[PDB]
Short mmCIF file of C-alpha atoms and ligand atoms in Angstrom, two decimals:
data_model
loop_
_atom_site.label_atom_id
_atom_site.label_comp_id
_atom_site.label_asym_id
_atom_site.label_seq_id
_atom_site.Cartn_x
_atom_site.Cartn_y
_atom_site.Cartn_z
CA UNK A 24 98.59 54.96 164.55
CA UNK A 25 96.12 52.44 164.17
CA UNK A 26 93.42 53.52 166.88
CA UNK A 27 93.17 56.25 164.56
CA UNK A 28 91.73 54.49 161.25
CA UNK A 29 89.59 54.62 159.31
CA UNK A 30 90.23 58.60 159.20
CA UNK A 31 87.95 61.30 159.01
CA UNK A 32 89.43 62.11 155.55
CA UNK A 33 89.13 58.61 154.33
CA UNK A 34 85.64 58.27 155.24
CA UNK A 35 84.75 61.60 153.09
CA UNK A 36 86.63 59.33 150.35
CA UNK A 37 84.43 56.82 151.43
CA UNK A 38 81.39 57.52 151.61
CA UNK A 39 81.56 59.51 148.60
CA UNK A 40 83.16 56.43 146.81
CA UNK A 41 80.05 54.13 147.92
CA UNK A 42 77.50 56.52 146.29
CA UNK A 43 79.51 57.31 142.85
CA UNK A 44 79.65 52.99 143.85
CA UNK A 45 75.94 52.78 143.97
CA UNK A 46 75.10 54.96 141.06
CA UNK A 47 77.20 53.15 138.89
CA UNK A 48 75.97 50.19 139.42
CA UNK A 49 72.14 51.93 138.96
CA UNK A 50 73.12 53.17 135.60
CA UNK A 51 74.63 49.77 134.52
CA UNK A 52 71.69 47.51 135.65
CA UNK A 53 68.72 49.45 136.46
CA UNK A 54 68.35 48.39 139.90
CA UNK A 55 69.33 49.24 143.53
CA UNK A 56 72.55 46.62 143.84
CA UNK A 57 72.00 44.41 147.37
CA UNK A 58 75.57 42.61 147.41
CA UNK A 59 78.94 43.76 146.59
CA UNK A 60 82.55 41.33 147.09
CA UNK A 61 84.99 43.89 148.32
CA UNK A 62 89.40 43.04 148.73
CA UNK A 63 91.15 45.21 151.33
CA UNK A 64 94.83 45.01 151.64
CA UNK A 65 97.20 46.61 154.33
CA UNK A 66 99.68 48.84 152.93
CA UNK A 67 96.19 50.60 150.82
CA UNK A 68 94.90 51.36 154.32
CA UNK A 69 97.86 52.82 155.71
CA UNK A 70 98.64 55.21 153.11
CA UNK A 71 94.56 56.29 153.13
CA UNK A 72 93.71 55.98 156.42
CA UNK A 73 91.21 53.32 155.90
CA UNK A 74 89.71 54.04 152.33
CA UNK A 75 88.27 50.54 152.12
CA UNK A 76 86.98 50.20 155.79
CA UNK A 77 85.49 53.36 155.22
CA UNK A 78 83.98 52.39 152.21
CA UNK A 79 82.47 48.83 153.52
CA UNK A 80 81.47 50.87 156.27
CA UNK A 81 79.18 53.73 153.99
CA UNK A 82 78.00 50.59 151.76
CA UNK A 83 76.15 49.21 155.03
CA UNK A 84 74.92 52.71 156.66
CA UNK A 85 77.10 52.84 159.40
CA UNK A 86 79.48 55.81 160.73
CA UNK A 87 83.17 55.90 163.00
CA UNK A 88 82.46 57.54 165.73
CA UNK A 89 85.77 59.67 166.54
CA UNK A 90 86.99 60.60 170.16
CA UNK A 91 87.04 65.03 169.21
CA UNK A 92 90.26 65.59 170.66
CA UNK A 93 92.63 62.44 169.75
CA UNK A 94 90.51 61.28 166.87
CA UNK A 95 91.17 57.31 167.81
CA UNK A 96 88.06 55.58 166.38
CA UNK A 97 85.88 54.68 169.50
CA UNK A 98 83.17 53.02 167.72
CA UNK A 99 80.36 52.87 165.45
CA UNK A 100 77.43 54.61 164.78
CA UNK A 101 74.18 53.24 162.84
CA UNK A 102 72.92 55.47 159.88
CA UNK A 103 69.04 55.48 160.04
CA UNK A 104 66.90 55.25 157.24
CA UNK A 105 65.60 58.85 157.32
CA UNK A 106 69.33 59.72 156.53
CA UNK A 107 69.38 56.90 153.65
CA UNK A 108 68.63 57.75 150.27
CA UNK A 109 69.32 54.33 148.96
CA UNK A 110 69.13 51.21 150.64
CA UNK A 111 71.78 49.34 152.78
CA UNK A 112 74.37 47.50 150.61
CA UNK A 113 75.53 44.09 151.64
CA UNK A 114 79.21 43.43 151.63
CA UNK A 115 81.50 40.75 151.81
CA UNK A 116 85.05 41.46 152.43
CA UNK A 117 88.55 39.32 151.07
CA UNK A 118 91.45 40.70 153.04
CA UNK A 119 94.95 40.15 152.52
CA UNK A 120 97.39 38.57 155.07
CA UNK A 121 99.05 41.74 155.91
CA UNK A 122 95.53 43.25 156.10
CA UNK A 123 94.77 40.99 158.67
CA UNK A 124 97.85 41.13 160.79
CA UNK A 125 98.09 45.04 160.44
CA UNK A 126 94.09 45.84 160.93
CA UNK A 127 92.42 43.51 163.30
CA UNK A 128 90.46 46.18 165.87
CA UNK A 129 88.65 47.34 162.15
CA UNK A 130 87.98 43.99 161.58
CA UNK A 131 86.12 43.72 164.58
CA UNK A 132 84.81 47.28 164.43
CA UNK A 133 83.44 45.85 160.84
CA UNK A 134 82.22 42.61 162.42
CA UNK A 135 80.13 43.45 164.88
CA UNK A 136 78.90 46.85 162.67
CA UNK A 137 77.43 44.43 160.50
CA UNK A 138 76.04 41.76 162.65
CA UNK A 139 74.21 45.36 164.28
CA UNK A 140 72.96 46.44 161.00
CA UNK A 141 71.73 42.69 160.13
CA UNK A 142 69.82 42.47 163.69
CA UNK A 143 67.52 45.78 162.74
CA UNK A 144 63.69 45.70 161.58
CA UNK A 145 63.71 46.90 157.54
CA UNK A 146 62.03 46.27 155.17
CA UNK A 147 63.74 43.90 152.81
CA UNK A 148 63.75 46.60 150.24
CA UNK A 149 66.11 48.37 152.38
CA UNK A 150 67.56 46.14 154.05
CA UNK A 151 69.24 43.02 152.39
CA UNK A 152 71.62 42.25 154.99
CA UNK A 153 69.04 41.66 157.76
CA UNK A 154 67.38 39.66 155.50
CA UNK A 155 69.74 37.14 154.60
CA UNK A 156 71.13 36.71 157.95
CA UNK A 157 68.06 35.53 159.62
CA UNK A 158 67.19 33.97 156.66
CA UNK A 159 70.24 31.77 156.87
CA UNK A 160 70.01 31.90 160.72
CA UNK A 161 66.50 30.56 160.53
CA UNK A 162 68.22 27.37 158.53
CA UNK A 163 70.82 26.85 160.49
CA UNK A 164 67.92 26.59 163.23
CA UNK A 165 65.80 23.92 161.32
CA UNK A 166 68.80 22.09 160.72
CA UNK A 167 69.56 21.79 164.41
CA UNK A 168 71.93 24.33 165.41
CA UNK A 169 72.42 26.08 169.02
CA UNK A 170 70.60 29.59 167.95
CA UNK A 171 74.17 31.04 169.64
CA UNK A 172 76.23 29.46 166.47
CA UNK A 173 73.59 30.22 163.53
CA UNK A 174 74.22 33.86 164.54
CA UNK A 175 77.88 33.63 164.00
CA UNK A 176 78.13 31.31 161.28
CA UNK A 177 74.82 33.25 159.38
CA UNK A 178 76.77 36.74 160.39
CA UNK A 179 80.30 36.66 158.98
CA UNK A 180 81.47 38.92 156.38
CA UNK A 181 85.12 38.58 156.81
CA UNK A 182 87.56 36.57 154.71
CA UNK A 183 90.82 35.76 154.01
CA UNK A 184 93.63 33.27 154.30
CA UNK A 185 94.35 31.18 156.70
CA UNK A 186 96.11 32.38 160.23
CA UNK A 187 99.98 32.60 159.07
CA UNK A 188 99.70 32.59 155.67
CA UNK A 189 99.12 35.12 152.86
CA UNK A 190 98.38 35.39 148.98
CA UNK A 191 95.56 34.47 146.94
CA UNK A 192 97.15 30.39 146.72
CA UNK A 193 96.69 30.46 142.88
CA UNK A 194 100.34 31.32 142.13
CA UNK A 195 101.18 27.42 141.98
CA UNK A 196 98.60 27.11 139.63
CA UNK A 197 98.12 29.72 137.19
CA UNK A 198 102.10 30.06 136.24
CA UNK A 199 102.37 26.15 134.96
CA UNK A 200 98.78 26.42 133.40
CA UNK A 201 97.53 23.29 134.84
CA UNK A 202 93.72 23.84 134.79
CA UNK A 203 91.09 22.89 132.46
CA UNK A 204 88.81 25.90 133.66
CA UNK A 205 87.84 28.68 135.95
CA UNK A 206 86.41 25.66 137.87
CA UNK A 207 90.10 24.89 138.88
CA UNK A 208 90.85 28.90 139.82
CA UNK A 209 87.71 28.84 141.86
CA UNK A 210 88.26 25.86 143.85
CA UNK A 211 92.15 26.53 144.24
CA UNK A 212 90.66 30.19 145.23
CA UNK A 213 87.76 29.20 148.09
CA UNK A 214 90.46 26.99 149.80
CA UNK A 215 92.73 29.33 150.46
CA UNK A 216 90.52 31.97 151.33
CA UNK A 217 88.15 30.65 153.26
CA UNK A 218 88.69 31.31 156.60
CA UNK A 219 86.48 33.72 159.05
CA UNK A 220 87.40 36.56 161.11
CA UNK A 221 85.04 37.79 163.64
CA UNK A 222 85.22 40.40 166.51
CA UNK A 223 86.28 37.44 169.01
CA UNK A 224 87.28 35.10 166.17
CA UNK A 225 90.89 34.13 164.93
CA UNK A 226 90.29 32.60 161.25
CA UNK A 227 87.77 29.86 161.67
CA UNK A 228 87.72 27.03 158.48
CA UNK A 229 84.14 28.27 157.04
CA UNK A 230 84.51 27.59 153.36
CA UNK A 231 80.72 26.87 153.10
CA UNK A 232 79.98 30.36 154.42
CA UNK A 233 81.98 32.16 151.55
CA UNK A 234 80.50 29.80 148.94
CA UNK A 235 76.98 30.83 150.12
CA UNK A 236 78.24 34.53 150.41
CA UNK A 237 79.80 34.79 146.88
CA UNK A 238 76.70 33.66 145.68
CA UNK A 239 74.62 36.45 146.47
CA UNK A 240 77.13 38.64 144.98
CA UNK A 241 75.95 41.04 142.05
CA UNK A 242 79.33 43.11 141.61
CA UNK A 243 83.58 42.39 142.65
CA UNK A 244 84.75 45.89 143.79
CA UNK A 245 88.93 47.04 144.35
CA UNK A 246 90.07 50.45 144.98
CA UNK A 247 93.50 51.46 143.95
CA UNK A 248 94.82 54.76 145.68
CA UNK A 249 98.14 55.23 144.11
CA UNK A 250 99.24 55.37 139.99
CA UNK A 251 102.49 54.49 140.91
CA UNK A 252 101.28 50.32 140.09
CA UNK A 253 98.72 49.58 137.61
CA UNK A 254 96.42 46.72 137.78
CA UNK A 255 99.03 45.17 134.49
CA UNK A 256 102.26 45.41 136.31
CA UNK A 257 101.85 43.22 138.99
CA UNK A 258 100.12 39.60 139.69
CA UNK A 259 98.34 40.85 142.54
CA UNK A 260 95.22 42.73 141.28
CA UNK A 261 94.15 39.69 138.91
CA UNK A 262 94.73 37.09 141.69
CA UNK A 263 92.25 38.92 143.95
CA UNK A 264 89.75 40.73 142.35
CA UNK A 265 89.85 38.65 139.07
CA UNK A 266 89.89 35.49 141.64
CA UNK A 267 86.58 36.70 143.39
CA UNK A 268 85.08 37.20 140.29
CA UNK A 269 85.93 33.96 138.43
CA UNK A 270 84.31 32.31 141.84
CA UNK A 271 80.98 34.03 141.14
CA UNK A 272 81.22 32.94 137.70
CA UNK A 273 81.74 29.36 139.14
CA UNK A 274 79.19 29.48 141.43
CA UNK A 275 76.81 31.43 139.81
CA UNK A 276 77.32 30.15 135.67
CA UNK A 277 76.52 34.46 135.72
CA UNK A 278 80.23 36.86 135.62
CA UNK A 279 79.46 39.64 137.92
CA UNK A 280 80.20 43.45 137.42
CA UNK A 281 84.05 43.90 138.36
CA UNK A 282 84.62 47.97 138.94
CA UNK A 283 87.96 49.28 139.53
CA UNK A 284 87.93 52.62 141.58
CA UNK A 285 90.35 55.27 141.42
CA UNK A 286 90.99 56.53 144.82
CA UNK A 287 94.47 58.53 143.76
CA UNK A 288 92.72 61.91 144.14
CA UNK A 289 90.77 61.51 147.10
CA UNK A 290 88.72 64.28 146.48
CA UNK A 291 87.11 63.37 143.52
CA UNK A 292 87.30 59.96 143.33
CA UNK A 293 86.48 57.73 140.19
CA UNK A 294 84.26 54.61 139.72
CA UNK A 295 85.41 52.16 136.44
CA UNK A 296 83.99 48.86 135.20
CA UNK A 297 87.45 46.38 134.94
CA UNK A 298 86.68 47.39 131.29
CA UNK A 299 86.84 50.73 131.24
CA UNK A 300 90.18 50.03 133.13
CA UNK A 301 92.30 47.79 131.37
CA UNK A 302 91.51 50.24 128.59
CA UNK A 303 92.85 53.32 130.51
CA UNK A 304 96.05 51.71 130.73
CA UNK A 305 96.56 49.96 127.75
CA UNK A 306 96.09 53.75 126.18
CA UNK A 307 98.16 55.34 128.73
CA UNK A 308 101.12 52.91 129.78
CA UNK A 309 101.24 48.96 127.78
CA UNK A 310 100.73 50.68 124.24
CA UNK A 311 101.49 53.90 124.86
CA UNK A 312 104.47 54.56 122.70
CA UNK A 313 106.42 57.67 124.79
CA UNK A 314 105.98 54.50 127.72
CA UNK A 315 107.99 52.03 125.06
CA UNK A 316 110.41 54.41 124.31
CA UNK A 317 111.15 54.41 127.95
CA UNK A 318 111.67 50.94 128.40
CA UNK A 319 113.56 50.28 125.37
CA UNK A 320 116.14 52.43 127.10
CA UNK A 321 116.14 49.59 129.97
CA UNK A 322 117.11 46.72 128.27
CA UNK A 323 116.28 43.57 130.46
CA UNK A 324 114.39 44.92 133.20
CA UNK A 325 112.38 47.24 130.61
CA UNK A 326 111.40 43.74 128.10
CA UNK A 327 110.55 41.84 131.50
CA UNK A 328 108.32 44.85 132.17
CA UNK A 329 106.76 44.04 128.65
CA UNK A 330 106.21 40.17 128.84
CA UNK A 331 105.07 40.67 132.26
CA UNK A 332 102.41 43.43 130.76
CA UNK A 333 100.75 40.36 128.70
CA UNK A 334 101.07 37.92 131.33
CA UNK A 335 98.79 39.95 133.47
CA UNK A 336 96.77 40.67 130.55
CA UNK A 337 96.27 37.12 129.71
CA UNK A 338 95.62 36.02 133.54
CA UNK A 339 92.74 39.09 133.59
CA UNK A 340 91.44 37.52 130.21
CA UNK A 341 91.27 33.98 132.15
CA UNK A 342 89.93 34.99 135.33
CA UNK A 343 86.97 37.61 134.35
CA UNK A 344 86.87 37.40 130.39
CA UNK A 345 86.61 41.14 130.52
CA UNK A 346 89.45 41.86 127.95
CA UNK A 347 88.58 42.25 124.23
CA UNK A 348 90.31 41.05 120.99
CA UNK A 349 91.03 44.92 120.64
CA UNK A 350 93.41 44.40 123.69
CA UNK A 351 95.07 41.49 122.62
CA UNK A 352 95.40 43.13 119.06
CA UNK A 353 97.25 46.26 120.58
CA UNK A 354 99.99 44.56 122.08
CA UNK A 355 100.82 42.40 119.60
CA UNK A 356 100.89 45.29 116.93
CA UNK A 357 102.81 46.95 119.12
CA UNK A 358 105.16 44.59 120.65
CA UNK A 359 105.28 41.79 117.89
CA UNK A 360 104.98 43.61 114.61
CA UNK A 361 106.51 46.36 115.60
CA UNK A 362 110.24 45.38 114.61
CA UNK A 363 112.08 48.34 116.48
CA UNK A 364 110.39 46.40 119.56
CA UNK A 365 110.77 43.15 118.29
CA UNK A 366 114.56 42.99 117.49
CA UNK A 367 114.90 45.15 120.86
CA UNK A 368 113.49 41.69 122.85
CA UNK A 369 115.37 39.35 120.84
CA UNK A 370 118.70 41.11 121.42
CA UNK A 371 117.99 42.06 125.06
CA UNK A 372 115.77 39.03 126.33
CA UNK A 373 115.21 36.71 124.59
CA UNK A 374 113.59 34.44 126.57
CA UNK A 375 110.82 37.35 127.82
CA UNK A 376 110.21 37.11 123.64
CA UNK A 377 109.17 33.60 123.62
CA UNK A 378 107.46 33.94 126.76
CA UNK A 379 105.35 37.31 125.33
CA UNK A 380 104.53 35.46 122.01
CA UNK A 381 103.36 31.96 124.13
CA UNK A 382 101.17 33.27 125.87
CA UNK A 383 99.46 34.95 123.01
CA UNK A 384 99.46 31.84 120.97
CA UNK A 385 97.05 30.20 124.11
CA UNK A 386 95.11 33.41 123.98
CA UNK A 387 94.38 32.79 120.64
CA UNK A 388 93.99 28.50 121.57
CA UNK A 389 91.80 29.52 124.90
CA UNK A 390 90.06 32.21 122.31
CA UNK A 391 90.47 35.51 124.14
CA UNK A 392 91.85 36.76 121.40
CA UNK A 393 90.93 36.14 117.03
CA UNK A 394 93.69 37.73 115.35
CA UNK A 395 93.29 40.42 112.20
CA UNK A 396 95.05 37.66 110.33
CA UNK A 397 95.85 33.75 110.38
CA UNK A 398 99.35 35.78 109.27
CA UNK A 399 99.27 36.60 113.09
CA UNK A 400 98.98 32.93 114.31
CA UNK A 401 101.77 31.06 112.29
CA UNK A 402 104.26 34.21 113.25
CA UNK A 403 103.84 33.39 116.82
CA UNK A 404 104.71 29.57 117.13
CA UNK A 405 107.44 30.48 114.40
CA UNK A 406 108.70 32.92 116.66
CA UNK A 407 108.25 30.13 119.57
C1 LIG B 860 99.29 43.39 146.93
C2 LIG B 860 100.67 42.89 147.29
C3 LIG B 860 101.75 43.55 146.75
N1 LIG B 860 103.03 43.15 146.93
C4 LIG B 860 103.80 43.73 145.99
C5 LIG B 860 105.03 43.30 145.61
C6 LIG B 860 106.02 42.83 146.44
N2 LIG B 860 105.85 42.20 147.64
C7 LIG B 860 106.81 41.22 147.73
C8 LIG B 860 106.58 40.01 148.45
C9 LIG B 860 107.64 38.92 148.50
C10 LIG B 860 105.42 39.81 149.15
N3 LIG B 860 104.28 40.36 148.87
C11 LIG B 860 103.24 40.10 149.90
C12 LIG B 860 103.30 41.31 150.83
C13 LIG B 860 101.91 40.08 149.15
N4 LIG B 860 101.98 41.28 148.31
C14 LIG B 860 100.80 41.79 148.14
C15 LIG B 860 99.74 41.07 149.01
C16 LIG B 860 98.75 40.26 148.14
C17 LIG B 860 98.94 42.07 149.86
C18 LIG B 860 99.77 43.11 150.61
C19 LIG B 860 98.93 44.12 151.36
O1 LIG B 860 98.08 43.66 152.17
O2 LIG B 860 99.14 45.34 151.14
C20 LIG B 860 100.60 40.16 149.94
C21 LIG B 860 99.97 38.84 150.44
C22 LIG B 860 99.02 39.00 151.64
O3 LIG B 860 99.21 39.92 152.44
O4 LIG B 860 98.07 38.20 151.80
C23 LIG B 860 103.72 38.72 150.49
C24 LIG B 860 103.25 38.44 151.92
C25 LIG B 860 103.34 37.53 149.55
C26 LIG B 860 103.53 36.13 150.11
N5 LIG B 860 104.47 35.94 151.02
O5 LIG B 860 102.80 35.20 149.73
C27 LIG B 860 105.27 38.91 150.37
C28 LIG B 860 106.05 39.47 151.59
C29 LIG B 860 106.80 38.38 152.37
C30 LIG B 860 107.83 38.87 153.38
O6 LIG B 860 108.66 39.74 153.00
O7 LIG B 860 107.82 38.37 154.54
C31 LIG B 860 108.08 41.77 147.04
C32 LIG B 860 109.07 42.28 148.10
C33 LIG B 860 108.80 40.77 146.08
C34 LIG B 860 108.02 40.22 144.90
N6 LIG B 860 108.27 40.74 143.71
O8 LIG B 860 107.20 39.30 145.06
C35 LIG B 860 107.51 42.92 146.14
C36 LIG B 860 108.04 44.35 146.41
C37 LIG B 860 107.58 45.45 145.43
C38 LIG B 860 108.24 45.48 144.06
O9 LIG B 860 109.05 44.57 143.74
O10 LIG B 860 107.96 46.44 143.30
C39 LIG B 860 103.18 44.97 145.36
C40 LIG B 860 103.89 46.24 145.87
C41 LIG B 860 103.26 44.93 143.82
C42 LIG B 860 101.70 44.71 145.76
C43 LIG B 860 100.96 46.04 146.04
C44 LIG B 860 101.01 46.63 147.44
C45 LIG B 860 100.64 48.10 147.33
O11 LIG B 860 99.58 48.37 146.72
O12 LIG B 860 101.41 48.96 147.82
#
């Protein structure tokens, strides 16, 4: 039932979440954090009951207010600063085209929440949001606009494709490597995604608005609530949170934070830096060898599960720069040079071969990745 999200349960997750959120990014940087770029898909939400909402939701100070006896969501509640021990977060939000379609009445819950928060009288210390929006409002104003407008346009935090469509829009792009640099990402990136939703507001063209909003941002957030996908075993994860982050880096000439959150124990859940990430599976799944067994007793789906693992790799590497040589190294050693694996691709694949060792000859061309060896470089072209 929709009426019914974000959950009780799934606000504990979040607002527990936001803190471990905000002291992570303390402990990183030294300093209270002011903006975060948050994605929010659909089929997430479902199976949570509304982790991310919840979690947008805690980042601002603001609470669901449940109806006691069916527990449909019936509103929102302001937290007050006696009940703050760290200021307000701002948040920007990228949601998927099935998070739009499936979630619209916590769109608008998160809407107008915001535009609430953004209309109180803080102090700028603790209050970032209200600051920028009449900030931006007073522009708008000495610009020449109808006050009515500034306060929408100067008020959105919602963002996503364009009514009837879905994806990221870089899937064109990134697979026939046409682009000379994150530039091309970014742009292909703010097209696609730059269109508004609003409480009474249906996906409004407002690509200025997201420029200006991914601007201020100081850290890209995702949660992931399951272990059943991993951010290398699908296109998905790099195309929106490595996406976001690239457009920072575009905007900014400064990469922001990226953290990926484990929400699969919703109890205790855990805040990661991209980093910290990418290693955790690398370790545990891409080079873990009891996982290679496995998919050596797969044949053709189990060496497409390989190349895939280094396009995803190599597409992370691209988008956020965030992956080290010792990533690069660790596939190759153990995909490459390991000849049980090798001759195992060749016989049952090999085209997923020459794709694997391409793309980690333009890793080495792009430099996200200096080999132990110039042995390492001739191999791969051989091989290609
Ligand atoms: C994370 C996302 C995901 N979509 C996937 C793959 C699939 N979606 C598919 C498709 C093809 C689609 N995947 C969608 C649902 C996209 N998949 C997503 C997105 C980014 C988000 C989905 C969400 O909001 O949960 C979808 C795009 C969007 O909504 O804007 C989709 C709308 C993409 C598009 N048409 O451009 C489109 C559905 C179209 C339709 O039918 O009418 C497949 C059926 C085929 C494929 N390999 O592309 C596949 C099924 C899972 C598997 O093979 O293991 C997952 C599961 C890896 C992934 C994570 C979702 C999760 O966390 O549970």
């Amino acid at each position: 039932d929709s009426r019914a999200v974000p959950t009780p349960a799934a606000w504990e997750l979040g607002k527990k979440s936001a803190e471990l959120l905000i002291t992570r990014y303390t402990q990183d940087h030294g300093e209270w954090p002011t903006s975060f770029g948050l994605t929010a898909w659909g089929t997430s939400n479902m199976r949570t009951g509304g982790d991310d909402i919840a979690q947008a939701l805690a980042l601002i100070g603001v609470q669901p207010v449940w109806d006691m006896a069916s527990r449909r969501v019936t509103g929102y509640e302001i937290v007050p600063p006696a009940k703050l021990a760290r200021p307000r977060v701002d948040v920007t939000l990228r949601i998927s085209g099935f998070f739009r379609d499936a979630f619209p009445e916590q769109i608008a819950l998160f809407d107008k929440a915001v535009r609430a928060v953004g209309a109180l009288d803080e102090d700028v210390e603790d209050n970032p949001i209200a600051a920028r929006m009449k900030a931006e409002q007073a522009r708008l104003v000495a610009g020449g606009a109808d006050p009515q407008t500034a306060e929408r346009r100067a008020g959105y935090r919602v963002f996503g494709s364009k009514p009837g469509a879905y994806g990221a829009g870089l899937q064109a792009l990134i697979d026939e490597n046409g682009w000379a640099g994150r530039n091309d990402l970014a742009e292909a990136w703010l097209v696609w995604g730059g269109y508004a939703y609003g409480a009474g507001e249906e996906g409004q063209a407002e690509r200025g608005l997201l420029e200006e909003r991914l601007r201020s941002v100081q850290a890209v957030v995702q949660n992931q609530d399951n272990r059943e996908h991993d951010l290398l075993d699908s296109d998905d994860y790099y195309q929106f949170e490595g996406g976001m982050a690239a457009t920072v880096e575009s905007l900014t000439g400064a990469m922001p934070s990226v953290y990926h959150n484990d929400h699969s124990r919703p109890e205790k859940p855990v805040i990661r830096a991209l980093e910290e990430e990418l290693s955790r599976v690398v370790r545990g799944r891409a080079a873990n060898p009891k996982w290679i067994a496995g998919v050596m007793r797969h044949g053709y789906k189990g060496a497409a599960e390989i190349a895939a693992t280094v396009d995803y790799l190599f597409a992370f590497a691209a988008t956020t720069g965030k992956v080290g040589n010792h990533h690069f190294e660790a596939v190759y050693q153990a995909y490459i040079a390991d000849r049980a694996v090798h001759d195992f691709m060749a016989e049952k694949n090999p085209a997923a071969l020459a794709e694997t060792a391409a793309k980690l000859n333009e890793a080495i061309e792009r430099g996200f990745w200096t080999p132990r060896s110039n042995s390492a470089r001739f191999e791969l072209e051989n091989l290609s």
